[PDB]
Amino acid sequence: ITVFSPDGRLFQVEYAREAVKKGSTALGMKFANGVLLISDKKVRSRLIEQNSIEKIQLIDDYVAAVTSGLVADARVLVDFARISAQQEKVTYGSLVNIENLVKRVADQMQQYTQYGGVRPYGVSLIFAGIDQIGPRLFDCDPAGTINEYKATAIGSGKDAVVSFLEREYKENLPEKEAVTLGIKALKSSLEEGEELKAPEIASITVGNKYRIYDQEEVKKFL
Amino acid sequence: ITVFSPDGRLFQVEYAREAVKKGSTALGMKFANGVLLISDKKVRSRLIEQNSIEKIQLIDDYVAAVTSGLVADARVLVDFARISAQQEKVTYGSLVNIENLVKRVADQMQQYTQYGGVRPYGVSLIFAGIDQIGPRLFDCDPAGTINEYKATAIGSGKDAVVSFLEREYKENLPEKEAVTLGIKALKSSLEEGEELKAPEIASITVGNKYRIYDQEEVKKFL
Amino acid sequence: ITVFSPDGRLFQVEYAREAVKKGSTALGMKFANGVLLISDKKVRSRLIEQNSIEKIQLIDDYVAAVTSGLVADARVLVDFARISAQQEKVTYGSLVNIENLVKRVADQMQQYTQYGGVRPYGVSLIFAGIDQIGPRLFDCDPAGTINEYKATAIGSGKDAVVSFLEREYKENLPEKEAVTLGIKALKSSLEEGEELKAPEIASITVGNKYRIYDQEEVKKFL
Amino acid sequence: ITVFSPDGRLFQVEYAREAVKKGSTALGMKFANGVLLISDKKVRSRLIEQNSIEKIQLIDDYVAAVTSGLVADARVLVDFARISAQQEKVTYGSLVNIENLVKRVADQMQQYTQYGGVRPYGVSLIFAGIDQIGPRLFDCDPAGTINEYKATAIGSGKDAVVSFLEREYKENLPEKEAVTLGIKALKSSLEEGEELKAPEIASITVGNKYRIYDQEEVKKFL
Amino acid sequence: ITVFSPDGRLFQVEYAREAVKKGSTALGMKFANGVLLISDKKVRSRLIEQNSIEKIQLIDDYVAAVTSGLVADARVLVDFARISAQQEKVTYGSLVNIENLVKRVADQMQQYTQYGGVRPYGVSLIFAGIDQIGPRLFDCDPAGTINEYKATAIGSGKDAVVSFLEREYKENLPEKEAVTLGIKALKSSLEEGEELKAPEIASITVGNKYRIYDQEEVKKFL
Amino acid sequence: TTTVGITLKDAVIMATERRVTMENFIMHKNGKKLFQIDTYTGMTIAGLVGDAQVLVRYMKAELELYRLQRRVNMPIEAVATLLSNMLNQVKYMPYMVQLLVGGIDTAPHVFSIDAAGGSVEDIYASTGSGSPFVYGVLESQYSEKMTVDEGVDLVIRAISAAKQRDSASGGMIDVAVITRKDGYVQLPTDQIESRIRKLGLIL
Amino acid sequence: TTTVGITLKDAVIMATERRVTMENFIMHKNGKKLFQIDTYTGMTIAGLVGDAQVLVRYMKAELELYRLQRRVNMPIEAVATLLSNMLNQVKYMPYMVQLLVGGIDTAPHVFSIDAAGGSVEDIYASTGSGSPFVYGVLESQYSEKMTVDEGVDLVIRAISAAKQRDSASGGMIDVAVITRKDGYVQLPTDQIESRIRKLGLIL
Amino acid sequence: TTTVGITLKDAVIMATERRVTMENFIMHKNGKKLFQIDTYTGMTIAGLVGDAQVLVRYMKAELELYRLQRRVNMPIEAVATLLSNMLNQVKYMPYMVQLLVGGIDTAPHVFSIDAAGGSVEDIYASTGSGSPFVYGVLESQYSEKMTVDEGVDLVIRAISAAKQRDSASGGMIDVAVITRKDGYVQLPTDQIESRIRKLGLIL
Amino acid sequence: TTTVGITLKDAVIMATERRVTMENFIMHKNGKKLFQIDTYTGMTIAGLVGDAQVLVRYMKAELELYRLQRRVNMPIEAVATLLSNMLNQVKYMPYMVQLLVGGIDTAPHVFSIDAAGGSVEDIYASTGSGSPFVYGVLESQYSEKMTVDEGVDLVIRAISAAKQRDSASGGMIDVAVITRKDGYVQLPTDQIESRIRKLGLIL
């Protein structure tokens, strides 16, 4: 699990990544003075309570995450991120750079790829928020590898969504236009004939706290 | 016990789930201001005591669980939920959101899928009760995966019962009509010519504490 | 040892059950205001101190156990049951419900099927006594699975003994009639023309302590 | 992972060195009263935020590192090095010889080739800075082997860059000419018809703190 | 790694010795009132600093060591030797018998051939200096085996150097003649026509501290 | 503080006042010092407030846990024994409390527990600074043959007497009656107030 | 220090002054002793500055975490229970503080918490060296039927009186009003000063 | 010891004297009590010399680590908060110090921190045995509208008055000015002496 | 005890006496209080003998280790920082000592380190019961322009004066001079006696 192959590969980590590819698609993008997240939900049965166990999880008022891959692994990691954010705020009085929070989470993941008696987390996360530097968007994978982005995606439709954004994405769009772009990007990832039900959507702009779009505001984009 | 396969699967957890498909069938469903649970059981012998029968366990006065799979594993997780519920009541003076209890139980199960030197719990659980949000119904599986439901089932008859409920379930039924619906649902999971003996039934409504339907009250629904 | 098979089985646990099957037959039954245990001695060699390494063991004055399977594992579990009874009595001043004691023993057995680094106990037990609820009878297997009974058996002759009790067992018998039915049941488990030589018998009724029958008292029943 | 082959090789360490060969190219060289570092960047797409996940990492004001191989493993060593630098400064008031810091990092890497239950770090590092002896340039590999250099390289283009420097390198160049030579050595390692996108550059001269060339400073070389 | 073969061999320890056979040749010899070390030095690139990471290492002012095999492992053993020499000096006020230092080092190596979850050190050391007994010369191998010598060698040229000294060595040579016998002996171990570049040389005589011969002063003996 | 508990034939009556002081400084006129901790079990608290509060939370939790596990209520003597073990285990860093435990199992029981885990059963008991005054009233006027309504009047009298003479006692009087028939029943204030008038008393 | 918390029909009003002393030495005329710790929850601090400030940081962090985890604000009583558990756990090595916790859940609440974790709910409470003077003003002038506006004037008076007679109190009076409709609102300094004038007071 | 920190429009000015005593015994006439701990951050130290010197090293180390990790300087309030957590965590075995922390982030700030971790922001502050004399001079002559040259003259006066009256203060006055335009700059000794003369003073 | 260290342009001179007492009881007339601890570094010791002897052994061992590891001598200020960290780490169970550390790196340095790890650089310093007397001689007679022979005479005067007035000081004066050209040189006794003879002194 912590073993190099002859070519220098960590096969357990690359298998952890296969688990991530099975999760549903989520994306984030920076726009003029803000950042947003959009999560696809395949919600299934009418017997489910849809009003809970959400894909977009607030880490605090200024930072949110969405995950893909093993659901239980993901929850434990989101818990870790919340607590770790709180420890930083207690220590310094605030959280100046979200990048340090993402590194602490990614360090926890890296460690489960290096020590024996433990498997990697089968998870990918996107973190989005505003710190003292500005709006931020990062991703993080089973290995603890991180990147900061203008736009990005995770889950089964990752590659479709990113192909679309490479062509279509422009910096500094208004919130409404960015949401539209995102909704469109997400649609591109679907099988044709396959329709897109109520995605989760959340955004934040400089000077404010996160808003989660209510079920009504999301429709106006579908 | 904690290894990814090339396709990102955790086979030990998938096998622990096979253990759950062998247990007796239980179900829960929300109704008008309330939630109930119904458990089947195969008592073989007449030499067995009925009434010490350990199925539908109260966690506290407002929360109950049924389980399926390995009965000894299940008993350990029900003790964990009981103690964990008490620790929350002592810390905050009450239990505001049953979902946090279910997460602690599920987090305990996830860890046994991640750390070596230990096997997963071969158990699924349903938790039902009332908190500040209202009536809740959750399930939880060997991986520590949880969902909130309108109605659900676990055990060997799971698939039939869910199919039935998917066609027959309606919200905001009166308790009487819900219990009746649950009994029909459970009966539909049986062998042909196989009679349903007395199941356990428990319900709770907003502003009350759990009631266990006694031996004779149950019989009225058969 | 702590591993699921693809069908969800714990083979080490199932193999520990095989060692239990090789042990001597014992049984217990509830009767009018009481409960008894009968244990087939199955001795050989006039060189052994008969009436020394007793199969029926007092846990306290109100609770006894009989075991089957590996004798050394069994001794360890009985010692654990004794210390665990005293701990409860020191804490609360008395032991209100024998089931909790049985659960503590069962939990210790369960742990040994879940954690690597140990094998299960190759032991089954019957616990019989009187608590604040009335006369009690439980059994407990290598998995830490437990049941409450009106009558039950463990060991090589279990199936015959249960089969026989399933026919002949009547509820609220006088002690002397209960003991006879028990000797009857135990005889039926022997191979053709095999001879039952002095079992251990112990009994207890509400308001008294246990009595172990001595050798002269058992012969009267043969 | 901590095991000798019949010829006395540590294959796990050699496999970790394979991972290092896939990393992006970087180099350092001492010049007149100074030392510099230049890193190539495998730039994903325009969606990647460039201000970010720098290849050149300052360890303190007088010391910097650049790494190649597993990016999460490298991040962990770079954190370790920063803290280890601060611990020396607290202990003695300053950091007299940079080689003791590189040895502390290399010791930590050496351990992960000797104790079981961990894998080696899949990382090589170049450290460059000024101490009491003067300008310093070391490298460090997955085994914890260290060398001091005049000029050196790591990553995929290592062998190309090194052969170029072996012909082209001259001691005591002025900074401008050291940088120009470095850019040349990097271009030498590129696939024909592939274009140098614009590296990271950083230099330090005696008496001074590190400078990180900005994008338009690097432009005058590309 | 800590296992016997049927003929009572420790193959991991035999394999660690294979690593040692690959290092550069070094030798030590006692002469009149003194002892010297000479080390073969594989220069091998003009981009390497010809100054640091020496083969001859001072343990304290009166004791030096030279090593062959895995360089990182060697560095860790030398650090251990240094700290261990200081511990003795603090405890007793000085270091009476250098052999005890060598034994503490050899013990730490022996331990890594006996306890699981670690591999041996792939290192041989020669120690030389002066103590109350006089000039000392010891070797130490992967097993922790030690021997005291008049002259000895380690590295790929060991057999030739030892051959040569076994023929030509003479007790009580003056320093210059000893150094000359030493150099010749090192010349004899090379491949025909391959030239001896600048070796490291250090010597110590009774009532003095070590001196390291400078580049120019070595050249004289070539 | 004044608390009292008395047993009658098939009943336990427990009562307190409500004053919370910091030395002479009356912080709260109306603190709570009487709790139900199980179906047929009450507890009164005296001594350091944070300690007593922590103990009431623990006992609520453990007796609920215990009842679920055993499927019967913890016997009153078992409750006193549990508290004994708890307070004795930290005797050198103690909960600075006096406790009364009262309830019905197969009979009525009142237990008095001290800060070192000493537990003694009695027919009646009183704690806090006002307890000597209550012991005066009780010695003089208690009878084992009293009915519940007489019992209730008796404790109102004892605590009113205590309030008159113990400046660390005051506020409305809290009464609970515990029976097998009706369980643990806290009396409503208007009903306590009404009795205070008919008896001829104050606060 | 002087701090005060009052409940009214659907409001909580909390206020402090701002003096920080070391013995008689006025080091800071203008420290902060009133904090919002959740959407409808405020806290005032008295006692050792370092300990109180550590508590304020914890509480802001824990109430934020709880809210994310539970998706509802911690009930006010739950905040007080939490603090009560935390302070009692370390009662022999205490946070040397008095705390008030006030806010709105389904009803207004003010809780007073001591250094042993004794927590008691009240209609009003006051802490710090200036609190006995506040208690005098409130005994005489407080009414459950006051409006927010008159409650605000009440606490300014009470704290004005404390400042006049307690040399460890002084500086600008800080006021916050907590309602369901407006959340936690700190009254601006110029509004408090306007009130001081209208009522005929100083500092 | 005497140290002082003042804020101005876009400036912080910090200053100390240099005397190190062991009771009455003047051991060192020129100790250092003012340090740059970050690009725009200074600290002054009073109290036990070993504790203070240990803290100066931690803080230089930690603020540099943080700036490398975050790519921006630790906000001044975050520095006071960090110190405040450190000192409180060991309050029963404390660093025996008073600290001033001063600098610019988006604005000038001076924070005073005590041995229990209490931290309060102020417009100006002073620590050490000489501080009450400084507070006299500051009350009388400080104005928020002062220029930097005036502020520097002000602190020389305040420290010169403290040295005249506090025998545990003495030696050369040390001054640093902190701005965004120029960072932390310690004034040269000859510049301070020149001002001492122009103002009509000594030592 | 009396010890002293002085800096001159390119030299450090350190010196001690040798009396070891147990109160008034002169146990040893000829103890050693001055030690070379590195090529260009000396240390003096005052205070508890066992403590100070343990520190000398650590310092000799650590500075030699550091030198082997770094291939340069530890800078004098680094030695003082090392010591300062060590003593402070154990300040509530202290080494009961006062230390002087002197040497030449790029410049001459004297540091004085106390039992809490407080370390201060100065041009000269003295420790032990005899130090006040020494400080009198140095204040009156020290000049930064002195030559080595003059500085040597000065410390002999200073220590001779301390010996006359401090009964816990006595025995032969020990002197060492540290320069880059010559390293640490312990002056021969015969040469010190000759200077005592020359200068006109006693003991």
Spatial separation of the C-alpha atoms in residues F191 and F198, rounded to whole Å: 11
CA D25 to chain centre: 9
Q: Cβ contact (<8 Å) for G70 and B91?
A: no
Q: State the maximum Cα–Cα separation within chain G, in Å, rounded to a whole number.
A: 48
User: H184's torsion region: left (phi>0), alpha (psi -120 to 50) or beta?
Assistant: beta
| Percentage helix, strand, coil for chain I under 3-state DSSP, each rounded to 5 | 35, 30, 30
Contact list in B for residue F58 (CB cut-off 8 A) is 90
Question: Which amino acid belongs to residue H19?
Answer: R
- Work out the angle between the directed axes of helices C175-187 and C158-168 (0-180°, nearest 10): 130
Both structure tokens of I90: 């154990």
Closest by CA to G199, choosing from G140, G135, G152, G146, is G152
User: B200's torsion region: left (phi>0), alpha (psi -120 to 50) or beta?
Assistant: beta
CA distance B146 to chain G (A): 15
Spatial separation of the C-alpha atoms in residues E124 and E142, rounded to whole Å: 6
Contact list in C for residue B49 (CB cut-off 8 A) is 137, 147-150
Distances (CA, A) of G26 to G21, G170, H111, H130: 5, 9, 15, 15
By Cβ distance, the residue of H69, H71, H85 closest to A91 is H85
Residue H157's SS3 state is helix
Helix intervals (H) in I48-178: 49-70, 76-89, 131-141, 148-165
H69 vs D: CB within 8 A? yes
Spatial separation of the C-alpha atoms in residues I28 and H20, rounded to whole Å: 33
Contact list in D for residue A149 (CB cut-off 8 A) is 47-49
Question: Are the beta carbons of F164 and F5 closer than 8 angstroms?
Answer: no
Residues paired with E58 in a beta bridge: E64
Question: Are the beta carbons of D117 and A116 closer than 8 angstroms?
Answer: yes
Return all residues near G160 (Cβ < 8 A) that are at least 6 apart: G173, G196, G199, G201, G202, G203
Count of CB atoms within 10 A of residue F186's CB?
16
Query: Considering Cα of B124, then B125, then B126, then B127, what sign does the dihedral take?
Result: negative
Q: Cβ contact (<8 Å) for D91 and I75?
A: no
Contact list in I for residue H48 (CB cut-off 8 A) is 116, 118
CB-count burial class (<10 Å; 0-12, 13-18, 19+) for F26: middle
By Cβ distance, the residue of F57, F62, F68 closest to B58 is F68
**Domain extents in chain H:** 1-203
Spatial separation of the C-alpha atoms in residues H30 and I44, rounded to whole Å: 22
Distances (CA, A) of B29 to B39, B163, B182, B208, C158: 12, 14, 8, 17, 41
CA distance C184 to chain B (A): 17
Contact list in D for residue H56 (CB cut-off 8 A) is none
Spatial separation of the C-alpha atoms in residues A28 and A152, rounded to whole Å: 6
CA C178 to chain centre: 17
Give me Rg for the CA atoms of chain B. 17
Resolution (Å units): 2.4
| Percentage helix, strand, coil for chain E under 3-state DSSP, each rounded to 5 | 35, 25, 40
Closest by CA to A71, choosing from B158, B8, G68, is B8
Q: Which other chains touch chain I, taking contact as 3+ CB pairs less than 8 Å apart?
A: D, E, H
- In angstroms, the first-to-last Cα distance of chain A is 43
C13-18's contacts with Cβ under 8 Å and 24+ in sequence apart are: C13/C113, C13/C120, C13/C142, C13/C143, C16/C69, C16/C119, C16/C120, C16/C121, C16/C122, C16/C123, C16/C142, C17/C124, C17/C141, C17/C142
- What single DSSP character describes residue B48? B
Count of CB atoms within 10 A of residue E116's CB?
8
Residues paired with B137 in a beta bridge: B128
Spatial separation of the C-alpha atoms in residues C57 and C82, rounded to whole Å: 10
Distances (CA, A) of B126 to B46, B64, B134, B140: 28, 8, 17, 6
Query: Considering Cα of D121, then D125, then D129, then D133, what sign does the dihedral take?
Result: positive
Closest by CA to B99, choosing from B141, B123, B129, B69, is B129
Question: Which amino acid belongs to residue E113?
Answer: T
Taken in order of first residue, the domains within chain B and their CATH numbers are 1-222 (3.60.20.10)
Question: Which amino acid belongs to residue E180?
Answer: T
Question: Which amino acid belongs to residue D95?
Answer: L
Spatial separation of the C-alpha atoms in residues G100 and G122, rounded to whole Å: 10
Residue C128's SS3 state is strand
Spatial separation of the C-alpha atoms in residues A15 and B3, rounded to whole Å: 9
Closest by CA to E200, choosing from E34, E58, E81, is E58
Distances (CA, A) of H153 to H157, H160, H194: 6, 10, 11
How many interchain CB pairs under 8 A, A with H? Answer: 32
Torsion of CA I47, I53, I55, I61, to 10 degrees: 160
CA A74 to chain centre: 11
Residue burial G171-183, b: 16+ Cβ < 10 Å; e: rest: bbbbbbbbbeeee
Spatial separation of the C-alpha atoms in residues H45 and H43, rounded to whole Å: 7
Closest by CA to I105, choosing from I144, I125, I77, is I77
- What single DSSP character describes residue B3? P
Return all residues near I197 (Cβ < 8 A) that are at least 6 apart: none
Question: Are the beta carbons of H176 and H186 closer than 8 angstroms?
Answer: yes
CA distance I43 to chain D (A): 17
Spatial separation of the C-alpha atoms in residues G137 and G6, rounded to whole Å: 12
| Count helices and strands in chain I by DSSP H and E runs | 5, 12
| Count helices and strands in chain F by DSSP H and E runs | 5, 12
Q: Cβ contact (<8 Å) for A150 and D46?
A: yes
Q: Cβ contact (<8 Å) for I85 and H54?
A: yes
The answer to whether I1 is a known catalytic residue is yes
Residue B205's SS3 state is strand
CB-count burial class (<10 Å; 0-12, 13-18, 19+) for I55: buried
Closest by CA to G110, choosing from G122, G99, G119, G118, is G122
Residue H150's SS3 state is helix
Contact list in G for residue A90 (CB cut-off 8 A) is 57-58, 61
Spatial separation of the C-alpha atoms in residues B162 and A107, rounded to whole Å: 41
| Count helices and strands in chain G by DSSP H and E runs | 5, 12
- In angstroms, the first-to-last Cα distance of chain D is 43
Helix intervals (H) in chain G: 49-70, 76-89, 131-141, 148-165, 189-199
Question: Are the beta carbons of B171 and B150 closer than 8 angstroms?
Answer: yes
User: G200's torsion region: left (phi>0), alpha (psi -120 to 50) or beta?
Assistant: left
Query: The sheet that has H108-113: what strands, in order across it?
Result: H34-38, H41-47, H97-104, H108-113, H119-122
Both structure tokens of H86: 């450190």
- Work out the angle between the directed axes of helices H49-70 and I76-89 (0-180°, nearest 10): 110
F abuts H (3+ Cβ pairs < 8 Å): no
How many interchain CB pairs under 8 A, D with E? Answer: 94
Tokens 């220098």, residue located: A8
Among I1, I2, I3, I7, the active-site one is: I1
Spatial separation of the C-alpha atoms in residues A170 and A31, rounded to whole Å: 8
CA distance B183 to chain F (A): 26
Return all residues near D88 (Cβ < 8 A) that are at least 6 apart: D94, D95, D100, D101
CB-count burial class (<10 Å; 0-12, 13-18, 19+) for C21: middle
Q: Cα–Cα–Cα angle for I43, I1, I63, nearest 5°?
A: 15
Question: Which amino acid belongs to residue A170?
Answer: K
Q: Which other chains touch chain F, taking contact as 3+ CB pairs less than 8 Å apart?
A: B, C, G
Query: The sheet that has B34-39: what strands, in order across it?
Result: B151-154, B26-31, B34-39, B200-205, B211-212
Distances (CA, A) of A16 to A21, B3, D117, F41, G23: 9, 9, 19, 55, 62
Tally of CA atoms within 13 A in the half-sphere of B165 that contains its CB: 30
G69 vs B: CB within 8 A? yes
H abuts I (3+ Cβ pairs < 8 Å): yes
CATH class of H1-203: alpha beta
Distances (CA, A) of B121 to B53, C143, D58, E35: 21, 13, 47, 68
Q: What are phi and psi of G190, to 5 degrees?
A: -70, -30
Both structure tokens of C220: 């009267």
Spatial separation of the C-alpha atoms in residues E199 and E184, rounded to whole Å: 12
Question: Are the beta carbons of D178 and D37 closer than 8 angstroms?
Answer: no
Residue A67's SS3 state is strand
Spatial separation of the C-alpha atoms in residues C197 and H25, rounded to whole Å: 100
CB-count burial class (<10 Å; 0-12, 13-18, 19+) for A167: exposed
Query: Considering Cα of H92, then H95, then H96, then H98, what sign does the dihedral take?
Result: negative
Both structure tokens of F76: 């009153």
Distances (CA, A) of F201 to D91, F164, F172, F194: 75, 10, 12, 10
Spatial separation of the C-alpha atoms in residues A205 and A36, rounded to whole Å: 9
Spatial separation of the C-alpha atoms in residues I13 and I175, rounded to whole Å: 7
By Cβ distance, the residue of B82, B89, B93 closest to F68 is B82
Q: How many residues does the structure list for chain D?
A: 222
- What single DSSP character describes residue B149? B
C abuts F (3+ Cβ pairs < 8 Å): yes
Residue D161, H or E segment? helix D158-168
Nearest CA in chain G to F19: G120
- What single DSSP character describes residue D97? -
Distances (CA, A) of E63 to A10, A162, E75, H65: 44, 64, 16, 39
By Cβ distance, the residue of D91, D100, D132 closest to I82 is D91
Residue burial F3-20, b: 16+ Cβ < 10 Å; e: rest: bbbbbbeebbbbbbbbbb
Method used to solve the structure = X-ray
By Cβ distance, the residue of C109, C116, C147 closest to B117 is C116
Contact list in A for residue G57 (CB cut-off 8 A) is 89-90, 93
